Amino acid sequence: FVGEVAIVDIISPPPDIGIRIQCYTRQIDRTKTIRNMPPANTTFVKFVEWGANEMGLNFICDTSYNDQVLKNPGRSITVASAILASIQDMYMPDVA
Amino acid sequence: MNSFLKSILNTPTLTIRDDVTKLPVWKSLQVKKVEIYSPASVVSKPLAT
């Protein structure tokens, strides 16, 4: 697991003081924004590649939908976190 | 076994005193035993330094 701390608590009182922590993966993106304009007319794979470069992650894509043209795929994405929701939305549920 | 010759500093007499009145009470009793327990809790976790 790799993640960032989100929520803090205290569980057990003295003599033994124990704490609880909540971590989430890629939570840094919920603050970072988008500064590279997404492609207008393009195939699925290039949209995925742009998203991977924007977030900053090594990516692998292997789908039967690799040669389908999308129009205005991500022109309504506020921060970097909604990229994944965009990618999942189009070809649900076969594409995960 | 004469008794009533109680040594000082350790006179084995049970005195019960009301906390607001501060006057002895129930001096009609004849006690036979007394027990005192003083527990405490100690941590049981590995701890780090």
Under 8 Å between Cβ of B17 and B24: yes
Task: Kindly provide the resolution of this structure in angstroms, with one decimal.
Answer: 3.6
Taking the C-alpha atoms of residue B30 and residue B47, their distance in angstroms, rounded to an integer, is: 50
A16 backbone dihedrals φ, ψ, rounded to 5°: -115, 110
For chain A, the C-alpha Rg in angstroms (whole number) is: 18
C-alpha distances (whole Å) from A49 to each of A43, A61, B49 are 10, 9, 47
> Could you tell me where the beta strands, DSSP code E, fall in A1-96?
4-12, 18-24, 41-43, 69-71
Number of A:B CB contacts under 8 A? Answer: 8
What is the nearest CA distance from B29 to chain A, expressed in angstroms? Answer: 41
Chain A residues closer than 8 Å to B42 by CB: 15
A52 backbone dihedrals φ, ψ, rounded to 5°: -60, -45
How determined?
Answer: cryo-EM
The two counts, helices (H) then strands (E), for chain A are 2, 4
